Design an enzyme around this catalytic site. Structure first.
Site, mmCIF file in Angstrom:
data_model
loop_
_atom_site.group_PDB
_atom_site.id
_atom_site.type_symbol
_atom_site.label_atom_id
_atom_site.label_comp_id
_atom_site.label_asym_id
_atom_site.label_seq_id
_atom_site.Cartn_x
_atom_site.Cartn_y
_atom_site.Cartn_z
ATOM 1 N N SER A 78 0.862 -1.207 0.000
ATOM 2 C CA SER A 78 0.000 0.000 0.000
ATOM 3 C C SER A 78 0.890 1.247 0.000
ATOM 4 O O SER A 78 1.773 1.378 -0.868
ATOM 5 C CB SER A 78 -0.991 -0.123 1.168
ATOM 6 O OG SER A 78 -2.138 0.705 0.994
ATOM 7 N N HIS A 233 -6.802 -6.781 -1.743
ATOM 8 C CA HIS A 233 -5.734 -5.805 -1.533
ATOM 9 C C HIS A 233 -4.691 -6.327 -0.552
ATOM 10 O O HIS A 233 -3.507 -5.995 -0.664
ATOM 11 C CB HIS A 233 -6.340 -4.489 -1.029
ATOM 12 C CG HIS A 233 -5.344 -3.390 -0.760
ATOM 13 N ND1 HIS A 233 -4.692 -2.710 -1.769
ATOM 14 C CD2 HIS A 233 -4.970 -2.789 0.400
ATOM 15 C CE1 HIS A 233 -3.917 -1.778 -1.239
ATOM 16 N NE2 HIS A 233 -4.065 -1.805 0.075
#
Length: 255
Positions: A78, A233
């Site tokens: 991220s 994710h």
């Protein structure tokens, strides 16, 4: 064998790597999973932190402590891709390669906030995420705490309830430092620009959307791209074995 340094994203901590670290170690590698400033079990609070560069201090300090000739493979998740770029502009010679896993990929041609501003155009609605302001070093900084519903639906889409619970339990307030990033000097061609970069992504990512992830590849061409089929994710939680496979292949390629 390699020495991987695992680098979480904002509002997270070393704990997101709790499945991947034993697997890399079972392959024979050395693994360090850091808590950045005011993250995980770091003692500081975000309101003491005035920039991404100070946010990155435990990574810089770890790298400073590497004896000469020791190189590491950085693995960011991220926003951790930005911590990589900061570390790379000071210790590029200690970095054998950087691997960006469902992560931002900053460049050298534009300002350090470039890919973050692109991320908020592609994904402007952070659902139940709350925001606050504080002042540090004379600048007004917007902090955030990721909403539990955003966490459930857009980050931990495919994770089991026992992993999602850790997130509700351990995520802490942070900041994007977005205005500070915009004014920071560009990442440099000689430092960050010089490292080998491997980009790992999934089109099932529900926050770093395919449009964003593909735009980043086009904007700043990685040395290697791996596309992971499926997952979410949180690729080190839902596709842990695949990531360890990719990391073994990076180690085999880049020492």
């Amino acid at each position: 064998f390699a020495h991987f340094v695992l680098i979480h994203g904002i509002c997270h901590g070393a704990w997101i790597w709790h499945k991947l670290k034993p697997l890399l170690e079972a392959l024979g590698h050395k693994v360090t999973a850091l808590d950045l400033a005011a993250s995980g079990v770091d003692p500081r609070q975000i309101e003491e932190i005035g920039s991404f560069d100070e946010y990155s201090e435990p990574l810089l300090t770890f790298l400073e402590a590497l004896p000469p000739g020791e190189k590491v493979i950085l693995v960011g998740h991220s926003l951790g891709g930005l911590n990589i770029a900061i570390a790379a502009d000071k210790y590029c010679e200690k970095i054998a390669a950087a691997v960006f896993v469902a992560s931002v990929l900053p460049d050298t041609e534009h300002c350090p906030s470039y890919v973050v501003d692109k991320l908020m155009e592609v994904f402007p609605d952070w659902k139940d995420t709350t925001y606050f302001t504080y002042t540090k070093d004379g600048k007004e900084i917007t902090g955030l705490k990721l909403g539990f519903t955003l966490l459930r639906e857009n980050l931990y889409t495919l994770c089991g309830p026992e992993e999602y619970e850790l997130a509700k339990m351990l995520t802490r307030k942070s900041s994007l430092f977005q205005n500070i990033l915009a004014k920071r000097p560009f990442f440099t061609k000689e430092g960050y620009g010089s490292i080998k970069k491997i980009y790992v992504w999934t089109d099932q990512d529900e926050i770093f959307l395919p449009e964003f992830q593909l735009w980043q590849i086009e904007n700043y061409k990685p040395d290697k791209v791996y596309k992971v089929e499926g997952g979410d994710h949180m690729l080190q939680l839902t596709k842990t074995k695949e990531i360890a496979e990719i990391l073994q292949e990076v180690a085999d390629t880049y020492n």
